[PDB]
Amino acid sequence: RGFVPQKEIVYNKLLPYAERLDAESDLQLAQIKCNLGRAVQLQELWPGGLFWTRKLSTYIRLYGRKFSKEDHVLFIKLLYELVSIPKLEISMMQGFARLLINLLKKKELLSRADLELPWRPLYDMVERILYSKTEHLGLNWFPNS
Numbered sequence: 001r002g003f004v005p006q007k008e009i010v011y012n013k014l015l016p017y018a019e020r021l022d023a024e025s026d027l028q029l030a031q032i033k034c035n036l037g038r039a040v041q042l043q044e045l046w047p048g049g050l051f052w053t054r055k056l057s058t059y060i061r062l063y064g065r066k067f068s069k070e071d072h073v074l075f076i077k078l079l080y081e082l083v084s085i086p087k088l089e090i091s092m093m094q095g096f097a098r099l100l101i102n103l104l105k106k107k108e109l110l111s112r113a114d115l116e117l118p119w120r121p122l123y124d125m126v127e128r129i130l131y132s133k134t135e136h137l138g139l140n141w142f143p144n145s
Helices: 010-014 018-042 045-063 069-083 090-104 120-129
Strands: none
Touching: 010 018, 018 045, 018 069, 045 069, 045 090, 069 090
């Protein structure tokens, strides 16, 4: 194996065609990593970045996490920096934040040595949106959910 899988879904193992699943997962993971890094590097958020973020979401849901802990910290840091943007479109950050929550739900997987997220970006984020003066005036129109 190229990597040790992390918290892989057992049910995929039980499937009759589970042998092909490993190759499909590895290829899909490679595509996701390369394309998402590239889309951030070129700053093509609306066409491709959200697309590959959604691709990571379906990958996690279908195959479990199934990546190295190094990859896990990298995904976390990227989505955090992307979600922790000062003035990102809120409809945009909704999906990235949903993905980041999906990655971070299984706290036990990450050592607390592996990952060090800061808190001031999140504070500024919620202060922007949970307590927005501009919203009551009708300027900002936050989403419902």
